Symmetry: C3
Subunit: 255 residues, 3 copies
């Protein structure tokens, strides 16, 4: 079973494909998408409804890859739509760093197809975590020919952040006197405008302040965050005299 | 108009393409880039100056995509270069998550080409945020055959920075005695060397210090930052005695 | 020489490729990887063991690209496996932004191949920092035909991190009385669950505490981290009364 919500990688043209060999360009990996089907006009040939290797041995493969870390949850294979050709068993190989390749599950040989069109699906628990994956047919019927699809987790909503950083201080004696709940606002303009409204984290890196009968009171808050900047509100209360406070900030936009 | 400073996606080989069907490999999406043209020698066929479908109906397309989120600002289409074939109208589809596709602009049919070579450009306002985008020919002259280019915003430099994190303390009594402005430096080494110089944000997560007639004074600064590490300078002044301090740090490396 | 531990980009299918021209589909970029080799059977053509241009001039190229920034450390070229065709000199161009192209080493003409199968390697010092790169044959032997590989630095463990952010407080008087080492835990849930265990940095943004004979004491520690959340353990010791503390936190997810 293909888990609900998963991404069809070839359907969405998310992976580059490279076969070991092709019978010819009209039998190439571009024709390997699961359920691939073309013209039924038998007078002209518009391509095999599969990838088909040229060499017939145990060393053929399609490699599927891209820069990003995919979490593959399953793989589906299928035979050739237009001729009695199919892969009947295959091994999997993969790589997360693109330098070291590993055998999936110690070189597990997986039972594949029995006919032209029936879909056989394999599920990975836990997901294979890879940048490139390769299918390696071991046995076949008539010829090494397949359609297939790879399934991956969708991308997390938090992914691909943009970040801007900086520091901000009171800079003067605004909170160094008076009584009660006291506030002073520093307006921060981000060096560059965000696309979406960031979330902002702050951290104190300087405290110069007087206790009030032994009590220390200071707070920093970010507020009125927009795409262009925000307000760092420096806060004190009781009778505390804050001479200076400094925060670093980290602003993060996603999605 | 193609907006100034845009990225030509197929030109920079930035998108994978997948057609519904190919007339044959010599009419493949590999031959679809705007203005593609090959040998003019009529005696030998080196492929169409177009992508060309095999099936002729309303259901053909090219899908274009990649792991990343594009900000598509425009699209251009053109007919076949070497025969009288072009797409007269098409719809667009796109997807951000690669699970749910949306009809561009509620399924708007866009008037496309009426010759081989004139370029028809469509602007997107606002930009289309998608991982994958598909052109869906609705009407054609003679055959479903086209050349195209997709245009997108350049990558902004504040996106996907690298990060490294860690913690640093005084770890001893260095600032816990003495008078006036007092500093001790902690030389911090990042777990992995960066390829270029990061910035280094810090925040305090431990105070253990004595007041000086009721005044608290401490500070931390990251200085002398390199690809390999930085110095966290712990500071006190007056007659504050600082028993220990701790910072979490976050080193952020941009555009690499 | 190819530096030990480089990534072979074409081998791992990390780049889209686009030629200026193909002799035909059976001579396309898909057949261009270093050492590419097909059936040795002379009674049916299964494609060239090379890419081969259609037009024979000095304006042919393959463009290799993708979304992410690469650091290319070397190129390797080869001639055609199956006929006496090979590139004898070439130039390189690249782009980091996919708007502005630059000429490798001010258009240096690199001496290339001499036969079908010997591999000629060029080292890039420093690495070419590029999203796309293009090989431009200048001279050739019989036909513009080649095989190649591009080598890149492996991705750093620290790249493409994701970040989540929030705040936590004691929010009550738990730490405000008693004596000796006292702790209170706040369980934090991440707005979205992470795919793997993050690291969690914190920095204080509120202190409301009493000194203990002039000594200030407070600490925050992020503990018990999972995909779903963590514990912020607020800490005081000696006889300090902490009325409240607040932290911001930065949760960072690596290698995903
Ligand atoms: Ca057919
Ligand atoms: Ca031609
Ligand atoms: Ca052959
Ligand atoms: Cl404090
Ligand atoms: Zn990518």
């Amino acid at each position: 079973s293909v888990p609900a919500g998963s991404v069809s990688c070839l359907a969405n043209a998310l992976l580059n494909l490279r076969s070991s060999t092709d019978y010819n360009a009209d039998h190439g990996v571009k024709n390997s998408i699961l359920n691939f089907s073309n013209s039924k006009d038998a007078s002209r040939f518009d391509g095999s409804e599969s990838w088909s290797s040229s060499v017939l041995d145990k060393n053929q493969f399609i490699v599927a890859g891209s820069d990003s870390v995919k979490h593959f949850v399953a793989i589906s294979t299928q035979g050739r739509g237009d001729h009695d050709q199919w892969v009947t068993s295959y091994k999997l190989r993969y790589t997360l760093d693109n330098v070291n390749w590993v055998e999936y599950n110690n070189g597990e040989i997986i039972n594949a197809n029995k006919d032209r069109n029936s879909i056989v699906t394999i599920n990975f628990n836990p997901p294979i975590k890879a940048r490139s994956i390769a299918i390696h047919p071991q046995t076949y019927n008539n010829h090494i020919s397949l359609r297939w699809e790879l399934y991956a987790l969708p991308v997390k909503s938090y992914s691909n952040p943009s970040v801007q950083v900086g520091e901000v201080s009171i800079g003067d004696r605004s909170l160094n006197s008076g009584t009660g709940s006291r506030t002073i606002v520093r307006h921060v303009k981000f060096p560059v405008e965000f696309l979406s409204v960031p979330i902002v984290s702050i951290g104190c890196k300087k405290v110069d302040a007087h206790t009030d009968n032994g009590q220390m009171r200071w707070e920093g808050k970010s507020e009125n965050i927009t795409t262009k900047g925000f307000d760092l509100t420096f806060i004190t209360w009781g009778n505390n005299a804050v001479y200076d406070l400094t925060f670093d900030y980290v602003a993060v936009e996603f999605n």
